[PDB]
Amino acid sequence: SSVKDFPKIKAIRSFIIGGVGSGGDYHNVKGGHWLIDSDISTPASKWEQYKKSRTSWGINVLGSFLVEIEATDGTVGFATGFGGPPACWLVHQHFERFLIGADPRNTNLLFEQMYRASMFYGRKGLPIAVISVIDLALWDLLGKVRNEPVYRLIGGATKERLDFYCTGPEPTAAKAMGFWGGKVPLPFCPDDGHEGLRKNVEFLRKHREAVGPDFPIMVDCYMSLNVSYTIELVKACLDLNINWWEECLSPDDTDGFALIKRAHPTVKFTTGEHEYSRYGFRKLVEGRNLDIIQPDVMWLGGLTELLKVAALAAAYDVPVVPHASGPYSYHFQISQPNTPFQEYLANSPDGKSVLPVFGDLFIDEPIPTKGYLTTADLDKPGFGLTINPAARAKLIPSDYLFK
Amino acid sequence: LSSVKDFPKIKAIRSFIIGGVGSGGDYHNVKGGHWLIDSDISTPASKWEQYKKSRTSWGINVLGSFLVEIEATDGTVGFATGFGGPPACWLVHQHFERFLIGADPRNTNLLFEQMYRASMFYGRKGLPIAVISVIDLALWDLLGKVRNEPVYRLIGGATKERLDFYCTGPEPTAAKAMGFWGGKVPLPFCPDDGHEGLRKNVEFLRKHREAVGPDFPIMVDCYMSLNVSYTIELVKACLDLNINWWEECLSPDDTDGFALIKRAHPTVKFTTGEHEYSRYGFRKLVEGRNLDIIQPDVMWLGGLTELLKVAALAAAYDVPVVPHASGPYSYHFQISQPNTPFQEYLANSPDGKSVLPVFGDLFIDEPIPTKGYLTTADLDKPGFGLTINPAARAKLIPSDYLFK
Amino acid sequence: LSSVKDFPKIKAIRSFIIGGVGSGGDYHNVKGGHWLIDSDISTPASKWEQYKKSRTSWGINVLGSFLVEIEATDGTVGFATGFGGPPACWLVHQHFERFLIGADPRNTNLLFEQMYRASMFYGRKGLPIAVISVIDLALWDLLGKVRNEPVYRLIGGATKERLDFYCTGPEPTAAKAMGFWGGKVPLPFCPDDGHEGLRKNVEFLRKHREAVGPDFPIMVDCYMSLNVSYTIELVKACLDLNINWWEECLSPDDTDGFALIKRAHPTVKFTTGEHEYSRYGFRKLVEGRNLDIIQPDVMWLGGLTELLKVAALAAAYDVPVVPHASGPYSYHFQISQPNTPFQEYLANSPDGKSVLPVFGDLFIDEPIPTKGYLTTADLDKPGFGLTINPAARAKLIPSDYLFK
Amino acid sequence: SVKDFPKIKAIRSFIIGGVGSGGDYHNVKGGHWLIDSDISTPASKWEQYKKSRTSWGINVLGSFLVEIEATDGTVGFATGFGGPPACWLVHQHFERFLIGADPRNTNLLFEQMYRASMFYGRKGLPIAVISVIDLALWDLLGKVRNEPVYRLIGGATKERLDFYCTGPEPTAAKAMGFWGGKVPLPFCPDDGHEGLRKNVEFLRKHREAVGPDFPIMVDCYMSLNVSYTIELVKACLDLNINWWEECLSPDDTDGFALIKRAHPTVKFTTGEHEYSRYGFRKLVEGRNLDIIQPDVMWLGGLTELLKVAALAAAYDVPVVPHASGPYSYHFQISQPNTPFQEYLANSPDGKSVLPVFGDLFIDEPIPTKGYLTTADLDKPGFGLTINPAARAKLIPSDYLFK
Ligand SMILES: [Mg+2]
Ligand SMILES: [Mg+2]
Ligand SMILES: [Mg+2]
Ligand SMILES: [Mg+2]
């Protein structure tokens, strides 16, 4: 009588995305893509048979999945992420019980229940990725019911333009397209010894020469190094003026950054894409040994938990720059006090062009073909992503997993 | 783009000083006789005989209350009240209005950051921040009204369907009888009264404990009037009384002192925060985890936008946030977060034996916990659900005269 | 080579979901009425009414149990069970099988590092690690069978000839009567039940202390359901009950909180760890030496291979390791290390008054501590000494359907 | 039912006569660089003990061998330094814990020997004795099972083991295939600034001889101090030294916190003269050491080494044992945090690879090409067979009890 009668959650559906290159799993791409077939230092590079390809050790094992949440009024919110079959299984077997019949505006409650109820087998990893996509679907639903973009529901626009840096093998392409900086993947791991270190130095030197003395260059190490190696490598590259070194250490050793900072206190280091929950991120802010924390919105717990993570970081003026994530990150970056810019993970096989982060799953993903986006690009209900009707044929119902 | 709601922009902002007393955000600008100002209460000024008997003697009621109205281009008006009076209104128009006119009210994060950083040279804490807080609350009231939704449904929904209250006042037996889960009494004597005062404080608490029985929770408010050594000795002298928690024992300037207090009484709970401001001020109270509960006042710390960030920081360490009784502004907040367990109700009756509106006759529909609790249904009104009493309109003094 | 044993390589790996309930590694996937799911137990979900009376209500039994079989080229088959069900089986074949086929099963260190580091992008803790744990245990079972030796004789031998147990369940008088050295009871109410819940918790523990006498050791399991302040107050309220130790008082996400708990109760023992994973996860529980005992679950933390490394680190600080239940997988470990003093047995009888197989009817010869202890002789069988019940194989659901 | 494992029937001890044979690396013939070249040591402070390491007694103990025979006739053995006093302790103290025991009870036997000798041990000689006994137990276990020790402690984490060479000729190390060369620091702090400049020139010459890329490490044999180390390292920054080894006395590992404050981008190592899991935990705490280097024959043995490596692994600190031959090879090839092996050049001039234990064994696998593979280690136990010729040099320890 006095306030809006908000529709409640009626049902939840999940699908696995058939094929590759479509959906939230960044690394479930076709062979030849630099993301899986170029020289990239990884936790498995220690072993020859898992050194030449990231798919060899299973970086693409999970695949992508999609969650749809339908309200009693017919409005449907959705989101995608990596997790595939196992994720869909958990969606229905465990989390559905908390959603059906609930007021979707109760984001704080739903997250706490899903998180604490799965604590015995979760807290980090796959289960949290599942909660993340469910939470993102809820926000998409809330935006659509109110007919407002998600960013207008979480603080508004703190900026009217979102500037991107490009992650890929071709920083000169990033520069030419308008991106403010380029992040390249380190090719060799510590096990390659000093030989690999010199090759790593040459690889970076070549890029620095190619883009000029001013273009910012960042280095992604995909949690593949160690303290001693990181310190030696960074020292060897001091004249290359690297902007920052990303995820040098395993997510299990964030304590190691106190040691890295002791050695290179004037050098920037970042990490976080493989960390989860507000409890996990509080440790990355503690000690302030990380210049930027980079959670993945589809992995850390979702938008609801991300808002809390950013608030804690904001109390220490630590910037939050999410790992890729597309619109799920765009709506977040454009609305907070401490979210300076955005990352775009080059999704073209050669890293020379900008293609949709989620492939052909959606038909209207806003892309930074000129290195940036504006609030206008995000002025669509929810997260603004419309499922490509032609992609429905590729959406496999998860029903078979329960037969 | 036309693909989404066309939200109205901010058209104008108005401010008023609330005439008289007992109405508005200033809890302490009340009529003489009210225990809030005329009972024995230890304060930072109790050190001096002429300022020990009443809190008004030294100026606790000097500012008064003020009201801010923010009107959107569609005619919708959001508002909020708080303490600050004339000087607060002066700042609203002279400094902050420039950031508001023509802005999208949904840009709460941007507007807060601009007002806070732009007033940093004379603010960061205190009066200027209280001004920003009331403006921010008015923005949220406006947002809820435009969307036709209660504020709590815009900041996380309901994490609980019922909000339980504890009652702050001189009569915990009344609090118990009314349904409140606990009672917080004000400490009567300050450190300068010496050991006699300490004995009198102990006797004061002993009698309250005996009156409510051994199980009813009793908390003690010290209004930032003690010091480390006195707190340690007082707490020790009261161990057998089973005090639930000791509130604001130290000056807000010495939160570092709780490390020393915790070293002495690690099994005793301590709280503080009503006179702390910004996310930068509160990060300190969470650091070291020497405070069991942080208690910011929504109308003082910076507003709801900033409070949401303060609560999130505390939540990462599972530190509960229980705001200093701020009426609906705190109710909508407490009902929505994962670490906001209960609420405080500052007995506003002269004798502390009954529950009356926190903001007096300024509004006509303030939800009150006469039974010691409120429900989400009680909060189901647009914005903060407060409607100005048309009769109070006459008391609303335009701030225009301050610029003549 | 021609001078040493020609060890068979891994030929194939099979996984099965255990149909029904009460059989397999999932301790909580049991029939209704079992105290493990239907008694008053404080949990992380006890904050919500609809989830506080039953642990199955919020999903403690959602995963189910699964079995892994690893067959060597000589036809020898090693196997192990654990919780994880369908999703666990999916991962076994889709991700981990690639590292196992054709490998030398004696390369336990290599295989664990590969599975762990290759799944770090979505693992490090939780379900994925539980999968790796069961595969590792199956590898050890296989190694013992190929060499015709018990697993304990392959990881250090016997550091003791007898393994003493304490009993976890609602009836400590039964534990005492059956010969167990101590009894661990589950705390009934969570912090959200306030002071009333706290008084009830105290009365609950007092009743048990009264029942077993002043000398019988009583431990309290809190199933990661409390918080720092509540734990401190509860322990203080139970000081005269002489509780041996308080288990998993905090969420596994806040082990840092034990520093605060120890500051308040330095003479009281605290334990945790059943929901922590990897050597990297456990190194934190040993740092600061704020935990008197760490308790990993061998089927969850990463496996026996990783557990051996966790125990070695703890051993450098003389911190005892007492794994969570785990049956034979834990018995073989506890009997072989320098810092593994005793073992836990989770009373699996619906009323907690008798001891039954931990894995139910899945096996036909599980050694059980009916007298409160086991001996090295009880463990003298190839591998982990568990023989699959033929009648249970029909209950074994091939995971094949998950890939159709 | 299960295997009926043979129990320990007896234990025998022998002193290895002469020099150049056995576990005492430094009990060699005069002229060997190990004892007669310029090497900074704890005793370099005194002129009469400056020129040779034997002058102050680095070779005073000698080598000894322990044989443990099981009831089935199988015999496991190991060698180490300790000589006569070591043999005395083997029988007078430790034999009581071994006779009649199941050799598979490695954890129990180690704890009993260590804790029972705590009143006069914990570090040093007594621990070296326990180590050799423990190694003999593992040799026995592998032989009874007809498996290499590495297949009993985790398998192979690598199929190839790369070595770096310790000696005065890094160009020889490079030529032979070793990935790096570790040279001994010639002068101690007591030689003042003059000695420091000579140390710098000494290292510069080696760097210039092997080129800018070949890894060069510097061994300081626990002879320096904090201030001197800080000044020396600073003076050599342009030489790109890979790591500085055992700069401080084993009694002052706390000093590395100070060294790291000064040179946080420089690698430091130590540990060959540290013992037990309790001793090594301190080297891992603070993470001020980039590599810990216990000697398998001194720290307590393989059983304890496995625990030391596990603690280090929790912090990703690599463990690279000091020399040790097969006792270390089997360990390095099997752990997650044991990247490479050290080969202490035993040739007098340091230009060739000779057996670590001399002519004591007849089949010691040697890294003539700078590496070894799992195939080289595929022998029962530690794969060392006593040289029939050497049997004559095996002096029964019996005379020590008469
Ligand atoms: Mg990255
Ligand atoms: Mg107060
Ligand atoms: Mg437990
Ligand atoms: Mg050395």
Coordinates of C-alpha atoms in Angstrom, one line a residue, chain D residues 29-355:
Chain D
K29 CA 95.9 -36.3 1.7
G30 CA 98.0 -33.2 1.9
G31 CA 97.9 -30.9 -1.1
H32 CA 94.1 -31.3 -1.7
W33 CA 92.5 -27.8 -2.1
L34 CA 90.0 -28.9 0.6
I35 CA 92.7 -28.5 3.3
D36 CA 95.7 -26.6 1.7
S37 CA 94.4 -23.7 -0.4
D38 CA 93.5 -20.2 0.9
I39 CA 90.2 -20.7 2.7
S40 CA 88.6 -18.4 5.3
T41 CA 87.6 -20.4 8.4
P42 CA 86.6 -19.8 12.1
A43 CA 90.3 -20.3 13.0
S44 CA 91.8 -18.0 10.4
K45 CA 92.0 -15.4 13.1
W46 CA 95.3 -17.1 14.2
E47 CA 98.3 -17.1 12.0
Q48 CA 99.4 -20.7 12.9
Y49 CA 95.9 -22.0 11.9
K50 CA 95.5 -19.8 8.8
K51 CA 97.3 -21.8 6.0
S52 CA 95.8 -25.3 6.4
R53 CA 92.5 -26.6 7.6
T54 CA 94.2 -29.6 9.1
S55 CA 96.4 -27.4 11.4
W56 CA 93.4 -26.7 13.6
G57 CA 91.9 -30.2 13.2
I58 CA 89.2 -30.2 10.5
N59 CA 90.3 -33.8 9.9
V60 CA 90.5 -34.9 13.5
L61 CA 87.6 -37.3 13.6
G62 CA 88.0 -39.4 10.5
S63 CA 85.4 -41.7 8.9
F64 CA 83.4 -44.6 10.3
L65 CA 81.0 -47.2 8.9
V66 CA 77.9 -48.8 10.5
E67 CA 76.5 -52.1 9.4
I68 CA 73.0 -53.2 10.6
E69 CA 72.2 -56.8 9.9
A70 CA 68.6 -58.1 9.9
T71 CA 67.5 -61.6 10.9
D72 CA 67.3 -62.7 7.3
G73 CA 71.0 -61.9 6.7
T74 CA 70.3 -58.7 4.8
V75 CA 72.8 -55.9 5.7
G76 CA 72.3 -52.2 5.4
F77 CA 75.1 -49.8 6.0
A78 CA 76.2 -46.2 5.8
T79 CA 79.4 -44.1 6.3
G80 CA 80.0 -40.7 7.8
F81 CA 82.6 -38.7 9.8
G82 CA 83.0 -39.3 13.5
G83 CA 85.7 -41.9 13.6
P84 CA 86.5 -43.7 17.0
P85 CA 84.3 -41.6 19.3
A86 CA 81.4 -42.1 17.0
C87 CA 81.9 -45.9 17.1
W88 CA 82.2 -45.8 20.8
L89 CA 78.8 -44.1 21.1
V90 CA 77.2 -46.5 18.6
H91 CA 77.7 -49.5 20.8
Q92 CA 77.7 -47.9 24.3
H93 CA 74.5 -45.9 23.8
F94 CA 72.5 -46.5 20.7
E95 CA 72.8 -50.2 20.2
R96 CA 70.3 -50.8 23.0
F97 CA 67.5 -49.2 21.0
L98 CA 68.2 -51.2 17.8
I99 CA 68.6 -54.9 18.6
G100 CA 65.4 -56.7 18.0
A101 CA 63.5 -53.7 16.6
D102 CA 61.6 -53.6 13.3
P103 CA 63.8 -51.5 11.0
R104 CA 60.6 -50.0 9.5
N105 CA 60.1 -48.1 12.8
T106 CA 62.3 -45.2 11.6
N107 CA 60.3 -42.6 13.4
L108 CA 60.4 -44.4 16.7
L109 CA 64.1 -45.3 16.6
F110 CA 65.1 -41.7 15.7
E111 CA 63.0 -40.2 18.5
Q112 CA 64.5 -42.6 21.1
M113 CA 68.1 -42.1 20.1
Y114 CA 67.7 -38.3 19.9
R115 CA 65.8 -37.8 23.1
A116 CA 67.9 -40.4 25.0
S117 CA 71.1 -38.5 24.1
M118 CA 69.6 -35.1 24.6
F119 CA 71.6 -34.6 27.8
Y120 CA 74.9 -34.5 25.8
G121 CA 73.7 -34.0 22.3
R122 CA 71.0 -32.1 20.3
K123 CA 73.8 -30.8 18.1
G124 CA 77.2 -32.0 16.8
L125 CA 78.9 -35.3 17.0
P126 CA 76.2 -37.3 18.8
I127 CA 73.8 -36.3 16.1
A128 CA 76.2 -37.3 13.3
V129 CA 76.3 -40.8 15.0
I130 CA 72.5 -41.0 15.0
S131 CA 72.5 -39.9 11.3
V132 CA 74.7 -42.7 10.1
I133 CA 72.7 -45.3 12.0
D134 CA 69.5 -43.9 10.5
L135 CA 71.0 -44.0 7.0
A136 CA 72.1 -47.6 7.6
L137 CA 68.5 -48.4 8.5
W138 CA 67.2 -46.9 5.3
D139 CA 69.8 -48.8 3.3
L140 CA 68.6 -52.0 5.0
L141 CA 64.9 -51.1 4.3
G142 CA 65.6 -50.6 0.6
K143 CA 67.6 -53.9 0.3
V144 CA 64.9 -56.0 2.1
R145 CA 62.4 -54.6 -0.4
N146 CA 64.8 -54.6 -3.3
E147 CA 63.9 -50.9 -4.0
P148 CA 66.0 -47.7 -4.2
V149 CA 65.6 -45.5 -1.1
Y150 CA 64.1 -42.7 -3.3
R151 CA 61.3 -45.0 -4.2
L152 CA 60.5 -45.4 -0.5
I153 CA 60.3 -41.7 0.4
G154 CA 58.0 -40.1 -2.2
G155 CA 59.3 -41.4 -5.5
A156 CA 60.9 -39.2 -8.2
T157 CA 59.7 -35.6 -8.5
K158 CA 62.3 -35.3 -11.3
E159 CA 63.9 -37.8 -13.6
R160 CA 67.2 -35.8 -13.8
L161 CA 69.3 -34.3 -11.0
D162 CA 71.4 -31.3 -11.9
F163 CA 74.5 -30.5 -9.9
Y164 CA 76.6 -27.4 -9.3
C165 CA 80.3 -27.9 -8.5
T166 CA 82.0 -26.7 -5.4
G167 CA 85.7 -26.1 -5.8
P168 CA 88.5 -23.6 -6.8
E169 CA 88.1 -24.1 -10.6
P170 CA 84.6 -22.9 -11.8
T171 CA 85.8 -23.0 -15.4
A172 CA 86.3 -26.7 -14.9
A173 CA 82.8 -27.0 -13.4
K174 CA 81.4 -25.2 -16.5
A175 CA 83.3 -27.4 -18.9
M176 CA 82.2 -30.6 -17.2
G177 CA 78.5 -29.7 -17.5
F178 CA 77.7 -28.4 -14.0
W179 CA 75.2 -25.6 -14.0
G180 CA 77.2 -23.5 -11.6
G181 CA 80.3 -23.1 -9.6
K182 CA 80.7 -22.4 -5.9
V183 CA 84.2 -21.1 -4.8
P184 CA 85.7 -20.8 -1.3
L185 CA 86.3 -17.3 0.1
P186 CA 90.0 -17.0 0.8
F187 CA 90.4 -14.3 3.5
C188 CA 88.7 -13.7 6.9
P189 CA 87.6 -10.4 8.6
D190 CA 90.8 -10.3 10.6
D191 CA 92.8 -9.6 7.4
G192 CA 91.1 -6.2 7.5
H193 CA 90.4 -4.0 4.5
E194 CA 93.4 -5.5 2.7
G195 CA 91.9 -8.9 2.9
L196 CA 88.5 -7.6 1.8
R197 CA 90.0 -6.1 -1.4
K198 CA 91.8 -9.4 -2.1
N199 CA 88.5 -11.3 -1.6
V200 CA 86.9 -9.0 -4.1
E201 CA 89.7 -9.4 -6.7
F202 CA 89.6 -13.1 -6.1
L203 CA 85.8 -13.2 -7.0
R204 CA 86.2 -10.8 -9.9
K205 CA 88.8 -13.0 -11.5
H206 CA 86.4 -16.0 -11.4
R207 CA 83.5 -14.0 -12.8
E208 CA 85.7 -12.7 -15.6
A209 CA 86.9 -16.3 -16.3
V210 CA 83.5 -17.9 -16.6
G211 CA 81.6 -15.1 -18.2
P212 CA 78.7 -12.9 -17.1
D213 CA 76.1 -15.7 -17.2
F214 CA 77.6 -18.7 -15.5
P215 CA 76.3 -18.8 -11.9
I216 CA 79.0 -18.3 -9.3
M217 CA 78.3 -19.0 -5.6
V218 CA 80.6 -18.1 -2.6
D219 CA 81.2 -20.4 0.3
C220 CA 82.4 -18.6 3.5
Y221 CA 82.6 -21.6 5.8
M222 CA 81.0 -19.8 8.9
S223 CA 84.0 -17.5 9.1
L224 CA 82.6 -13.9 8.7
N225 CA 80.5 -11.6 10.8
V226 CA 77.5 -9.3 10.1
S227 CA 79.5 -6.0 9.4
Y228 CA 82.1 -7.7 7.3
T229 CA 79.5 -9.7 5.3
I230 CA 77.6 -6.5 4.6
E231 CA 80.7 -4.6 3.4
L232 CA 82.0 -7.6 1.3
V233 CA 78.7 -8.2 -0.4
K234 CA 78.4 -4.5 -1.2
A235 CA 81.8 -4.4 -2.7
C236 CA 80.9 -7.3 -5.0
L237 CA 77.5 -6.2 -6.2
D238 CA 78.7 -5.8 -9.8
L239 CA 79.9 -9.4 -9.8
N240 CA 76.3 -10.8 -9.8
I241 CA 77.1 -13.5 -7.1
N242 CA 74.3 -16.1 -7.2
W243 CA 74.4 -16.6 -3.4
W244 CA 76.6 -16.2 -0.3
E245 CA 76.9 -19.4 1.7
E246 CA 77.4 -19.8 5.5
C247 CA 78.7 -16.3 6.0
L248 CA 78.0 -16.4 9.8
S249 CA 78.8 -18.8 12.6
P250 CA 76.0 -21.4 13.1
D251 CA 75.6 -19.8 16.5
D252 CA 74.3 -16.5 15.0
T253 CA 71.7 -17.3 12.4
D254 CA 69.7 -14.4 13.9
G255 CA 72.3 -12.2 12.2
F256 CA 70.8 -12.9 8.8
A257 CA 67.9 -10.5 9.7
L258 CA 70.6 -7.7 9.8
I259 CA 72.2 -8.9 6.6
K260 CA 68.9 -9.0 4.8
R261 CA 68.1 -5.5 6.0
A262 CA 71.3 -4.3 4.2
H263 CA 71.1 -6.6 1.2
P264 CA 67.5 -7.7 0.6
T265 CA 68.0 -8.4 -3.1
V266 CA 71.0 -10.8 -2.4
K267 CA 70.7 -14.5 -1.7
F268 CA 72.1 -16.1 1.4
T269 CA 72.3 -19.7 2.5
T270 CA 73.4 -21.8 5.5
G271 CA 72.7 -25.0 7.5
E272 CA 75.4 -27.5 6.9
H273 CA 76.4 -27.1 10.6
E274 CA 72.9 -27.0 12.0
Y275 CA 71.0 -30.0 13.4
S276 CA 67.5 -31.5 14.1
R277 CA 64.1 -30.3 13.0
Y278 CA 64.3 -27.9 16.0
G279 CA 67.5 -26.4 14.7
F280 CA 66.3 -25.9 11.2
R281 CA 62.9 -24.4 12.1
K282 CA 64.9 -21.3 13.1
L283 CA 66.5 -21.0 9.7
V284 CA 63.0 -21.0 8.1
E285 CA 61.5 -18.5 10.5
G286 CA 61.6 -15.0 9.1
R287 CA 62.6 -16.4 5.7
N288 CA 66.0 -14.7 5.8
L289 CA 67.7 -17.6 4.1
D290 CA 67.0 -18.4 0.5
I291 CA 68.3 -22.0 0.8
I292 CA 68.9 -24.3 3.8
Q293 CA 71.7 -26.8 3.4
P294 CA 71.8 -29.6 6.0
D295 CA 74.3 -32.5 5.6
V296 CA 72.3 -35.7 5.6
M297 CA 75.1 -37.5 7.5
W298 CA 75.2 -34.8 10.2
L299 CA 71.7 -33.2 10.9
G300 CA 70.1 -36.4 12.2
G301 CA 69.7 -38.6 9.2
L302 CA 67.1 -39.1 6.4
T303 CA 64.2 -39.6 8.8
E304 CA 64.7 -36.2 10.3
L305 CA 65.7 -34.6 7.0
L306 CA 62.3 -35.6 5.6
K307 CA 60.7 -33.6 8.4
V308 CA 63.0 -30.6 7.9
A309 CA 62.2 -30.5 4.2
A310 CA 58.5 -30.7 4.9
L311 CA 58.6 -27.6 7.1
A312 CA 60.6 -25.7 4.5
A313 CA 58.2 -26.8 1.9
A314 CA 55.3 -25.1 3.7
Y315 CA 57.2 -21.9 3.1
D316 CA 58.5 -22.9 -0.4
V317 CA 62.1 -22.7 1.0
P318 CA 64.3 -25.0 -1.1
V319 CA 66.5 -27.6 0.7
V320 CA 69.8 -28.3 -1.1
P321 CA 71.9 -30.7 1.1
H322 CA 75.6 -30.2 1.6
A323 CA 77.4 -32.8 -0.6
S324 CA 76.5 -36.2 0.9
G325 CA 76.7 -38.3 -2.2
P326 CA 73.8 -40.9 -2.7
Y327 CA 72.5 -40.1 0.8
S328 CA 71.6 -36.7 -0.6
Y329 CA 70.9 -37.8 -4.2
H330 CA 68.0 -40.1 -3.2
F331 CA 66.6 -37.3 -1.2
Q332 CA 66.9 -34.5 -3.8
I333 CA 65.3 -36.6 -6.5
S334 CA 62.2 -37.2 -4.4
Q335 CA 61.0 -34.0 -2.7
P336 CA 58.9 -31.1 -4.0
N337 CA 61.4 -28.5 -2.8
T338 CA 64.8 -30.0 -3.6
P339 CA 65.8 -28.3 -6.9
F340 CA 69.4 -29.4 -7.4
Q341 CA 72.4 -31.1 -5.8
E342 CA 75.9 -30.0 -4.7
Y343 CA 79.0 -31.9 -5.8
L344 CA 82.1 -31.1 -3.7
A345 CA 85.0 -31.4 -6.1
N346 CA 87.2 -34.0 -4.5
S347 CA 90.1 -33.9 -7.0
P348 CA 93.1 -32.3 -5.4
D349 CA 93.1 -29.4 -8.0
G350 CA 89.3 -29.3 -8.3
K351 CA 89.4 -30.0 -12.1
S352 CA 87.8 -33.4 -12.2
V353 CA 85.0 -35.5 -10.6
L354 CA 86.2 -38.2 -8.1
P355 CA 84.0 -40.4 -5.9

